Symmetry: C3
Subunit: 368 residues, 3 copies
């Protein structure tokens, strides 16, 4: 059981994914491992990038702000069904990792970046529930409340365990473990508040907005401060800083579904996410500094959520300057998924290099 | 005059109440001291636990949400009068400590945990004023404003001195002194805003909500971070973390009396306090890990304030799920006061062990 | 190019303006330098103190709360025209410093206190635009929007560069550079939101309130914590702590011009600024501890902005206690400008000691 400070000392990268040049590991480097050891949990980010595109292309087809485009609702069918086959494929071959190689699953659970991808399978299930195709689900005002209790049940249980460790004083408190991926532990409170309103429970939705709001302020302020996260915070603007955009984008969508209006509390959350979007994508090294990794799928997710919030802003404020803002953020987000979709098929079948040896879990406990 | 870092180095416990095994002290250990040296200031927490129960049992008898119980208003008489004899008894035998043993009162004033119990005598006086029995005070719309100026006068003067030391840069700023008991310096801004509304001054009440709100956010965020408070922050969930519940509970009651409605600002404060309540009391080691101390009286206080805020939530949201929540939080809080009431009478008169030698004030200034 | 930690190690004072007793510098101490090296950027604070008095004396003459005084609107003429000759005089002789001595301008740009006075020339231009005399500008509902784009254009470009460096992880992030003068990088978001409303753009004004609100909370919380700013944070209450008052004062004026009412969000910002005003000016050492410096002009600025916010509070809450509060804050602020105006004319022409050798820029890069 490896300490949290030992992962920062032995690993290197914005995600702690490479071993340093002077570290010894417990497994061979050049021999090919069995497949269930080379399969990380970070490929639930492929499911986050696809299931968030099914929320967008239903909003583009069913909103009065974008009626002039005449977008067919069959784009939501093919993205919802393809995101549901990938989700049932990744989840089945990760349960087989827990049966045969459970000692490697525990190394990922205490890795300070990969804690937050255990929240990720249950956020994908809530994106597929607030965006069901109307071909499958007609004639309904409310979803059934048992859809909420099965998906937000294990999210809330794992949330009590992690948040209780943050405010206590031993060895995994937030000042020793924080990184930009810690925002993924907060954003499911706002996705779960949208899905609680659409089963008919507006007071449980107000409960989940307030626990997500209080823990967003703690993580946002603590990342501006002097704490032993050294290599996981890059020296200049990296694409990993897109995780800041996800929680104010989902907080403004959630407050609009609860109260029915895009008021001054919902605009303040939307305009914080829009400043962080501009100060990250409006550069020249964001486009020319592209190198593929599977962690790019999870950086697309919070830029698609910000496109959904600017469609709902274009409904409250009508006119041409808000139509043009909503169509230019939802063009950049879908054009990166199409780049990631083709370069994932080329790395899998033409070059065969999606799954190398996962060397970051095999480090030694004690020595440098 | 002992430095703040020397109290953390020489003392041990969640309240800094025991000396470590290698420390020498200025007074004998086994010989019995005079009584006014063995009498701490932390037994103003007995008055906080009793005077907060008089606010609850008047709310249970005078609210339309709990009319079906037919609770007599003579439970408020016997708790208000018993909390007023204990308050005039503790305050008289602490003035005699200041006359004869003022050098020991100064050691408690610079102790980083026991600073906050100098705010405590004036919060008890405001709990007894917002909960007077209607047998004594009938036919009144407003209290007299001089009741506010005598009790909130010395609270506000001592507040300017302490908060000015927090933001400055010398030797007792908040990053060097912070602990969970520092929330007791913030909560009297919200109790004083309830009592300012009930004398007819709604603009002074809005002033006191805003100074309590800004300093709640500073103390809440700074306890998640790397600062030299080492032993006063336990490694797992201790009952000392109930001090987090007190200030969001009183902030939601105060905003309701000012504006007359339990709106979306008042619900956000109530739902933060309810999450911290669940993640602290809904365990198995909260009930089986009971050891008596007089510091338990002060951990009952913020769980009674959270019962008052859920009675006022049951009035805004009518129906059976909010009646059952209000009756289950106000059962847990009154059943712990009844445990503490019997075990305080047994430790005082049957075993005679309430007041041992107060060894934490007699430490040396310099050496380890 | 000198590191940020080397400025804190080699310089001494609340503004880092003196060299320590064991430091060697690159230029002579006793020989008189050329004039463009002895001319700091901190004398844009003379323009901040004068242009903020033109906003006050137009509010005193055009508000229904202060109609009983019959103040002539010719006090706004003589202060607006005098603040506009000083602004065009300081700006012309600083462009000549950039042409001939650009290596000294770069030493001021990386000095951790003097970064924030590069934002200062564009805040002065927005104070002169929201307070134009009605003799020059009659018969207008809205200003032209190109007035906004020329003054807030270079403010917003320099804001993206600095705020992007704060949240990243290399060498000039906020935990390594913070001081009380860092609030001057935040306050132009609220002055620019007042001027965006008065050209007819209320959605750009709501964008600028939200970016200024989120970065106010980061700077306010980070100054309560343990970071290597050592000498720039004085041990007791210095006049440099008046920079805390500026941003909540301008945030309450800005929210009132956008929404047209002084509601519960605007009162919470005003009452935070009023507590910080009382806990800084209501002492005896604030008045008897007066020593002149040119940095005093910039400490007058946030006490004049707090006088403008209490005139607008006296309009929402009518009655004698709010008239007397507005006239006693706007008397203290104008009586210090009159002290600073006479002591600046005496130090310039009678004693000739406004511009000594600016020794803080000539330090060596490496050794102590």
């Amino acid at each position: 059981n490896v300490s949290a400070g030992r992962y920062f000392a032995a690993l290197r990268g914005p995600e702690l994914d490479e071993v340093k040049d002077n570290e010894d590991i417990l497994l061979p480097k050049e021999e090919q491992w069995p497949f269930l050891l080379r399969f990380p949990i970070g490929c639930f980010g492929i499911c986050l990038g696809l299931s968030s595109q099914a929320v967008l292309w239903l909003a583009l087809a069913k909103s009065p702000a974008t009626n002039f485009l005449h977008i067919t609702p069959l784009i939501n069918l093919v993205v919802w069904l393809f995101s549901l086959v990938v989700l049932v494929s990744v989840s089945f071959t990760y349960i087989l990792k827990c049966i045969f190689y459970f000692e490697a699953v525990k190394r990922e659970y205490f890795h300070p970046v990969r804690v937050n991808f255990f929240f990720a399978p249950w956020v994908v299930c809530m994106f597929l529930a607030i965006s069901v195709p109307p071909m499958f689900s007609p004639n309904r005002k409310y979803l059934h409340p048992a859809i909420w209790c099965v998906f937000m049940g294990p999210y809330f249980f794992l949330e009590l365990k992690i948040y209780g460790q943050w405010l206590s004083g031993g060895k995994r408190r937030l000042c020793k473990v924080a990184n930009p991926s810690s925002h993924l532990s907060v954003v499911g409170n706002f996705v779960g508040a949208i899905l609680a309103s659409k089963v008919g429970w507006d007071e449980v939705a107000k409960f989940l907005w307030a626990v997500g709001f209080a823990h967003y302020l703690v993580v946002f302020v603590t990342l501006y401060q002097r704490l032993p996260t050294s290599e996981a915070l890059p020296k200049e603007l990296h694409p990993v800083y897109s995780m800041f955009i996800a929680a104010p984008s989902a907080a403004s969508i959630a407050w609009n579904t609860i109260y029915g209006q895009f008021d001054g509390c919902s605009r303040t959350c939307f305009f914080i996410a829009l400043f962080l979007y501009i100060s990250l994508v409006a550069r020249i090294n964001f486009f020319t500094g592209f190198k593929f990794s599977v962690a790019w799928w999870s950086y697309t997710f919070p830029m698609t959520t910000a496109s959904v919030a600017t469609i709902k802003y274009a409904e409250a404020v009508p006119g041409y300057p808000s139509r043009a803002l909503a169509l230019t953020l939802s063009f950049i987000s879908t054009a990166m998924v199409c780049v990631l979709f083709v370069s994932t098929l080329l790395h899998a079948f033409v070059w065969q290099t999606l799954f190398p040896n996962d060397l970051a879990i095999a480090i030694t406990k004690r020595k440098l």
